[PDB]
Design a protein around this ligand. Sequence first.
Ligand SMILES: Nc1ncnc2c1ncn2[C@@H]1O[C@H](COP(=O)(O)OP(=O)(O)OP(O)(O)=S)[C@@H](O)[C@H]1O
Ligand SMILES: Nc1ncnc2c1ncn2[C@@H]1O[C@H](COP(=O)(O)OP(=O)(O)OP(O)(O)=S)[C@@H](O)[C@H]1O
Ligand SMILES: [Mg+2]
Ligand SMILES: [Mg+2]
Lengths: 332, 325
Amino acid sequence: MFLKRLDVIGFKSFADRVSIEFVPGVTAVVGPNGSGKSNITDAIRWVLGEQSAKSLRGAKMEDVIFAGSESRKPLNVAEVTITLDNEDGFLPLEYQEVSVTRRVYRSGESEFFINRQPCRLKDIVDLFLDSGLGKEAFSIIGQGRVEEILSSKPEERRTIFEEAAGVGGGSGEEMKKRFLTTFEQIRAHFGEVFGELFGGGRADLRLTDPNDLLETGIDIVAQPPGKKLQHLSLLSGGERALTAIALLFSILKVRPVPFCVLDQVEAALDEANVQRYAQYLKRFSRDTQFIVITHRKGTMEEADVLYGVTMQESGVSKLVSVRLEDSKELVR
Amino acid sequence: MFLKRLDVIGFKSFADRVSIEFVPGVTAVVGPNGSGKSNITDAIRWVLGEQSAKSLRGAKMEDVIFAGSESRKPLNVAEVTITLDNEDGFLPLEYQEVSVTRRVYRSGESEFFINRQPCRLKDIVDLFLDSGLGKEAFSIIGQGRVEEILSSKPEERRTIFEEAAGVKKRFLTTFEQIRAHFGEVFGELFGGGRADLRLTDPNDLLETGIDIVAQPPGKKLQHLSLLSGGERALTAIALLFSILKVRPVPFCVLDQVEAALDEANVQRYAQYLKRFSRDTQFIVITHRKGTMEEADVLYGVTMQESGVSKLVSVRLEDSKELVRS
Ligand SMILES: Nc1ncnc2c1ncn2[C@@H]1O[C@H](COP(=O)(O)OP(=O)(O)OP(O)(O)=S)[C@@H](O)[C@H]1O
Ligand SMILES: Nc1ncnc2c1ncn2[C@@H]1O[C@H](COP(=O)(O)OP(=O)(O)OP(O)(O)=S)[C@@H](O)[C@H]1O
Ligand SMILES: [Mg+2]
Ligand SMILES: [Mg+2]
């Protein structure tokens, strides 16, 4: 398993140190509104090298430091440490176990380390630059954001595919071949994944400009069971979400990543679709490590470990391992 | 005034006429993904006079005509009729029952009727002008759009308050009344904590923006943006109910606005919804049992036949498949 551990101290609602051990397969995170779950996903984005405070729902980076509660004073530093297993050599860093630590102080000062040795933010970025982590709409799906590829411009989608393809002269010719090759693989998987998730129907991808692989956009076409193909726009909230999930899974088949974070991607899905999704997720989890925030029983039942996050104390997150038989209040 | 009936004929997935009777109180519409529920809210927007096909998920207005399915051939006309109780003379017509019809043909013709007499789109728009009906973030909330006011820039928030007010001098009066409610509604919804609305520039009111302050119980005030998905959703819902308190409407359509809410917050939302239905009729699309439990009537939308929507009254105890878990 690639993601071994996440240590969080003073980051947002986690005033006290929490240490999260991940398992192979599916790690599910559950809990009531406002407890600190999405904050964990932010901690992951941050330690991987996120440079935009707004991407972390803040205005300035100092907003990610625990700012206090009715029961506590604000802290003046936040620290996140992620521990990774690089036995295969997935990283351009020839250590067995890799750790990355990021800190920020209320002064605005920051510190970065790789395996305990001080480094630059750029070193952390460079370290993960081609790993696949932790890119939105690719390896980390934010809450509310599952439809982001669908809502993108066709031209925007080409760029996603290019990046998944590892993309002048006859090198340009080579770039064309790679893009098309990756595009054909993804397209092929997309049709199949769509069918499995919906229990039928079909989906496909199209080039908007077949004459120009540099400039073409990508159209998405999807036909749920029983329906006539119509504009993607006319599809329902749940149909659009499940189409987005099919496309995501397909991209991850073609361009694997060491772990994927999914923050309530199944919100729009009905009971039948969540079940198909959760079983697919479980199968997929053999290849790729998933960390999911979920409120759905169907997903929780497929989980290899469940962590409940709560805020008994005003403003402060607590994380414990929980059994499903008594998470019954956390079932949507 | 209230909504008595909606007839939907050939509109989107409703190939066959479906006639939906409404009760005052809360009507919940339930069913599986892709079954036709949001399409019902689109029919309402459309018959009230919506001009933008894009607002209805289409590209051209023709897109709202049943376009065929695996089972059924495409149709060439779509028609929606809404029927309203005008006993009180809410509407400036002397009829006690008012109906409005809109049609579109695949060939491009339109018809508009008020009480069966042909009219223009403008006459329907003018008819409902003072009602406040079919206004996004006000009297209708589309799927996925509950945070529309919260995620608006302070200046854009103002315009919404203007439509709510009636758009000098009128903004401010409306703002202050909504502000006075927002604090209470936010507490009642969360079970505590404090919130407020603030004017950026109180000295210029054709221009100034509105800031929103929201602090859940025991938590400390930071940027609105740092609140959780469920917390922002419940805040937006508090603001919506605050708007409805001051600029009330005869009916309000809510398409899965409680999606981000946990079970406890759904329960508080749903009880609040029931109480609010004293003054306003609610038609809600929902998958949540707390909401279904507070509904006065439940309608289940399904596609037994591929691509074609049908609706029937359903019992809660027969709808366990539909309850989100
Ligand atoms: N710098 C900070 N200091 C203290 N608390 C914070 C800070 N930043 C954010 N929070 C709080 O952390 C709480 C939990 O945030 P999230 O992790 O977004 O909640 P969640 O568990 O994802 O809840 P959902 O999406 O409603 S089920 C929110 O109330 C924030 O207000
Ligand atoms: N003109 C049309 N002809 C036939 N079908 C249409 C037309 N317009 C939309 N639809 C279908 O309506 C379906 C979407 O229905 P909605 O009413 O949005 O679903 P929903 O019941 O809200 O489902 P959710 O949001 O996932 S629980 C799509 O699958 C479309 O194929
Ligand atoms: Mg969240
Ligand atoms: Mg819908």
